[PDB]
Structure 1
Amino acid sequence: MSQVEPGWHFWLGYGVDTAPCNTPKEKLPIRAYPYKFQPNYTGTPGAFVTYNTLKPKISAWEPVTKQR
């Protein structure tokens, strides 16, 4: 079921009367990026790997010696 593209997913569930290919231009989303459809990759090497998008809150000193 995750292979069904968004829009068609809504139509198949009787969300909208008119199908995506029949939807006028004014009611389509404008994108400034390329559109790519990807299904559920769970149980597969392509499964989502989560991570922290922040570097650590406290930064340590870079140790530097000085001569007396």
Structure 2
Amino acid sequence: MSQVEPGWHFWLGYGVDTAPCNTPKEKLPIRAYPYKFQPNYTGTPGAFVTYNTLKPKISAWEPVTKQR
């Protein structure tokens, strides 16, 4: 499972009468970018890894000496 396309995955679990090959294009969500379809890669080295999106809270001070 989860090797199927989303707009089908709805219909496989019987969300819609009309499979996405027969839907009108008005119900197509218009997108301004291409699509990639990563199914799932659990255990595979393509597994998702996490990290905090933001930097540390307090930046340090860079050492800048001053010859007196």
SS of aligned partner of 1:27: coil
Q: What is the TM-score of this pair, normalised by structure 2? A: 0.95
Q: What is the TM-score of this pair, normalised by structure 1? A: 0.95
> Can you list the C-alpha shifts for 1:29-56, whole angstroms capped at 9, x where unaligned?
1010101111110010100011111111
Q: Percent identity?
A: 100
Q: CA RMSD in A?
A: 0.7
Long gaps (5+) in structure 1: none
Distance 2:65 2:10 in 1: 65
Structure-2 residue corresponding to 1:51:
51
Long gaps (5+) in structure 2: none
